[PDB]
Write a protein that binds this ligand. Structure first.
Ligand SMILES: NNC(=O)c1cc(Br)c(Br)s1
Lengths: 272, 8
């Protein structure tokens, strides 16, 4: 019984991701998040070892083993008209969209640390066979005391494959020009495009493109003072041709990415 | 200049 194993608290938010409540695991008082998803609103389905669950549950189980920069699925339940997902909640926490809104454009030292952690989390997903397909500031939680970033909201994701994708339900302003123009993309190179959008967002205070014509136009205007090394990495991630984009290895070996702060240093300098 | 969330 779900209702007796958890004490439900205030609604945290609702949207394309469902309705998410704060919560407490009654057994050990562990802080949790309780996500409800109506069955009628679930487009992709999958199967675990043997049970017909939302694809989101399939993907979360593949990435939730061991420690990583992904919010871990602790449990799930099936209800007559919905699935309920129990997720580990850091406290205190703030999502990266609210963080950038309040702080403005981030110092490059802080964006380097954040962007590095996001890269490691995406690499972990891909190593687990999981393509997230909705990387953006809204889908990244910051553990303010530990200085650690966590990916959330796999409801637009897919199993990772090397063949072309012709479906997409992530966030359009982070989607690549080959999706806009052709409704085709490949997993890794599309992820790198969204990472370029995310990095620009971090160092400029907002995303570079709002309209389809800007996305496919491939001109990056910098509205804030940004170092030449960082501008180069961003424009590389945002190459119009997918095969001109860097691999994850090339991103992490880029000169702008060197000498990253540790998570605890990041909290003590920038978050505490 | 307005900054906004975007649904998915
Ligand atoms: N869509 N939101 C989530 O999956 C969330 C997980 C946690 Br932990 C918080 Br706080 S929000």
């Amino acid at each position: 019984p779900l209702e007796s194993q958890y004490q439900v608290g205030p609604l945290l938010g609702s949207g394309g991701f469902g309705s998410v409540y704060s919560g407490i695991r009654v057994s050990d008082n562990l802080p949790v998040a309780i996500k409800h998803v109506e069955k009628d609103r679930i487009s992709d389905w999958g199967e675990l070892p043997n049970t017909r669950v939302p694809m989101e549950v399939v993907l979360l189980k593949k990435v939730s083993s061991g420690f990583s920069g992904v919010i871990r699925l602790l449990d799930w339940f099936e209800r007559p008209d919905s699935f309920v997902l129990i997720l580990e909640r850091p406290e205190p926490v703030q999502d990266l969209f609210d963080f950038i809104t309040e702080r403005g454009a981030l110092q490059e030292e802080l964006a380097r640390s954040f962007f590095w952690q996001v890269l490691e989390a995406v690499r972990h997903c891909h190593n687990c066979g999981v393509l997230h397909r909705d990387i953006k500031d809204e889908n990244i939680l910051i553990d303010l005391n530990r200085g650690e970033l966590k990916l959330i909201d796999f409801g637009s994701g897919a199993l990772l494959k090397d063949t072309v994708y012709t479906d997409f339900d992530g966030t359009r302003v982070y989607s690549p020009p080959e999706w806009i123009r052709y409704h085709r993309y490949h997993g890794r190179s599309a992820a790198v495009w969204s990472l370029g959008i995310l990095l620009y967002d971090m160092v400029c205070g907002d995303i570079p493109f709002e309209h389809d014509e800007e996305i496919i136009g491939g001109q990056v205007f910098f509205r804030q003072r940004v170092s030449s090394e960082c501008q180069h990495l961003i424009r590389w991630c945002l190459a119009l041709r997918p095969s001109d984009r860097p691999t994850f290895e090339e991103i992490q070996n880029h000169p702008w990415m060197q000498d990253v702060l540790l998570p605890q240093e990041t909290a003590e300098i920038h978050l505490h | 200049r307005k900054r906004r969330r975007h649904p998915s």
